[PDB]
Amino acid sequence: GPHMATGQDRVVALVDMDCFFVQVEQRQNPHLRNKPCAVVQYKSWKGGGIIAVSYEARAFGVTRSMWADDAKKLCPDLLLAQVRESRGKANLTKYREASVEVMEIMSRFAVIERASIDEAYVDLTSAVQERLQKLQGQPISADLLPSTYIEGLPQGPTVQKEGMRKQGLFQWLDSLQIDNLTSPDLQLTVGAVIVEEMRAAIERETGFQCSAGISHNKVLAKLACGLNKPNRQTLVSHGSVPQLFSQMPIRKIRSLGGKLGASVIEILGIEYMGELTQFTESQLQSHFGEKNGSWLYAMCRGIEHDPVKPRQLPKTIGCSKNFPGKTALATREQVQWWLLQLAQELEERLTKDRNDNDRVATQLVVSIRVQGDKRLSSLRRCCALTRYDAHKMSHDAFTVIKNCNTSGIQTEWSPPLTMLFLCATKFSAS
DNA sequence: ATTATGACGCT
DNA sequence: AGCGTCAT
Ligand SMILES: Nc1ncnc2c1ncn2[C@H]1C[C@H](O)[C@@H](COP(=O)(O)OP(=O)(O)OP(=O)(O)O)O1
Ligand SMILES: [Ca+2]
Numbered sequence A: 001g002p003h004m005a006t007g008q009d010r011v012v013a014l015v016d017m018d019c020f021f022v023q024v025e026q027r028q029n030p031h032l033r034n035k036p037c038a039v040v041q042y043k044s045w046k047g048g049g050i051i052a053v054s055y056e057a058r059a060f061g062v063t064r065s066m067w068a069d070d071a072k073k074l075c076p077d078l079l080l081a082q083v084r085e086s087r088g089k090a091n092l093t094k095y096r097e098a099s100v101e102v103m104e105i106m107s108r109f110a111v112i113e114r115a116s117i118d119e120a121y122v123d124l125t126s127a128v129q130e131r132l133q134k135l136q137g138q139p140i141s142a143d144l145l146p147s148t149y150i151e152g153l154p155q156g157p158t159v160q161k162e163g164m165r166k167q168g169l170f171q172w173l174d175s176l177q178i179d180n181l182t183s184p185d186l187q188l189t190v191g192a193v194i195v196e197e198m199r200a201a202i203e204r205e206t207g208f209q210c211s212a213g214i215s216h217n218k219v220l221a222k223l224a225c226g227l228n229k230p231n232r233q234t235l236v237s238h239g240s241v242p243q244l245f246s247q248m249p250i251r252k253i254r255s256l257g258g259k260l261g262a263s264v265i266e267i268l269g270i271e272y273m274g275e276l277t278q279f280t281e282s283q284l285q286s287h288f289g290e291k292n293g294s295w296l297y298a299m300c301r302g303i304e305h306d307p308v309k310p311r312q313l314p315k316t317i318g319c320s321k322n323f324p325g326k327t328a329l330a331t332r333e334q335v336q337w338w339l340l341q342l343a344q345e346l347e348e349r350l351t352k353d354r355n356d357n358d359r360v361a362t363q364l365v366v367s368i369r370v371q372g373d374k375r376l377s378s379l380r381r382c383c384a385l386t387r388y389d390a391h392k393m394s395h396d397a398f399t400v401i402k403n404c405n406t407s408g409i410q411t412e413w414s415p416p417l418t419m420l421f422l423c424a425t426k427f428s429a430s
Numbered sequence B: 001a002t003t004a005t006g007a008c009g010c011t
Numbered sequence C: 001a002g003c004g005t006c007a008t
Helices: A019-029 A068-074 A095-107 A125-135 A161-175 A184-206 A217-225 A238-246 A259-268 A273-278 A281-288 A290-299 A330-357 A390-405
Strands: A012-017 A035-042 A049-053 A079-082 A113-115 A119-124 A146-149 A210-215 A233-235 A316-322 A329-330 A359-370 A377-386 A411-427
Touching: A012 A184, A012 A217, A019 A035, A019 A049, A019 A095, A035 A068, A049 A068, A079 A329, A095 A184, A125 A184, A146 A161, A146 A329, A184 A233, A184 A238, A210 A217, A210 A329, A217 A233, A238 A273, A259 A273, A259 A281, A259 A316, A273 A290, A281 A290, A316 A330, A316 A359, A329 A330, A330 A359, A330 A411, A359 A390, A377 A390
Parallel strands: A035 A079, A146 A233, A210 A233
Antiparallel strands: A012 A119, A012 A210, A035 A049, A113 A119, A316 A411, A329 A411, A359 A377, A359 A411
16 A cells, blocks of 8 residues: 555666667668668678668568578568678677767766667656756647657557557546656656657767657666657556556566576466566565565566666677687687787777776686587686787687697697687776 | 677576 | 676
């Protein structure tokens, strides 16, 4: 009752760029705009591997992970843009720089947590309070929410998509109590107004479109964001949760898309997030551990407390390359040459980072995969990163992994290496 | 023969 | 520390 938390204390948004690498390439090359297209890395093996796909191309069944030669079978007119190659490897700088463009715009509106290259969480609680003060009891017009969906609406006693969106929005606004500044539904609505403004600024100033979710916590904002893509935003209210979760597969909720989620389904014999409400907190803790159990108990009721962390920059800067099948590195010279290539890219990125962001990395992490090992990484070792110098970093990395070589012949490397990875970590202010 | 990333939890 | 999970 009066002491039961409802997790309605914050307004949190998640902004997620639409088909991001594709939009970066379409801005640069107008011939790719409004076309079925995809971004690919490398070209020699089966036309290259697809890593991003325009919505026009998705309509043909083109997906990430597909080889371009195969995507062409589904969509013969598919256009392609290739990721830059430097030092023998894919180089993602263009997309990292475009990400900074968007993150810097978002930061004007609120504190953001950079979740990935094209996603950021926004804590809008304070911005909403401020805006509510300006409004002064003034109602919110549907015109302020031109791309907003209200999940769950319309409901109760038009056959077109936009028509449905407006119908739901009208029902929501009709029911709002703008008289109460502490109303969580009103707070979410003002949050959505601000996110429309943020999304308009992103598009005006970069050309890029995005989707967004607005709710009371990160997990619901992330879920909301995916409900109406692309180029739309979705508000998930606390009250929408029981219906939304009643048919929502467990794997759709962030963090439950893997083994833990599979175990929840198997152990409890349930399919949907809402079904979790029938277990006590202690029951859930018994199966999934103290932390997970408490998290699940609250989450299935729409409640989550993970904060939006004030962090706009990545905490690590890494470079990696796979050497699949027959290309696995089998000589010491090979291993050394590629460590140098990786280290040269890393040096370039670190030097720019130090100049831009007033920080220096102090730890170098080296990871490798050996042929035969099913795991993505077979071994990881660290050493001090004391100088931004590619020859030094590559020599140091060789030193920490050189004893992994089984070969009795110094010149040969066995078992062959199928992945090299260098990562700079442990930043300190500079 | 997906590949190239990145954050965070466990022990 | 080094490994594993989950995710863009
Ligand atoms: N598995 C991956 N391997 C390499 N790059 C990836 C991978 N997943 C995502 N990316 C890159 C390319 C994407 O354009 C970018 C953002 O990813 P993501 O948000 O999952 O999809 P997207 O932005 O391409 O489409 P959507 O419109 O569905 O969000 O990150
Ligand atoms: Ca995206």
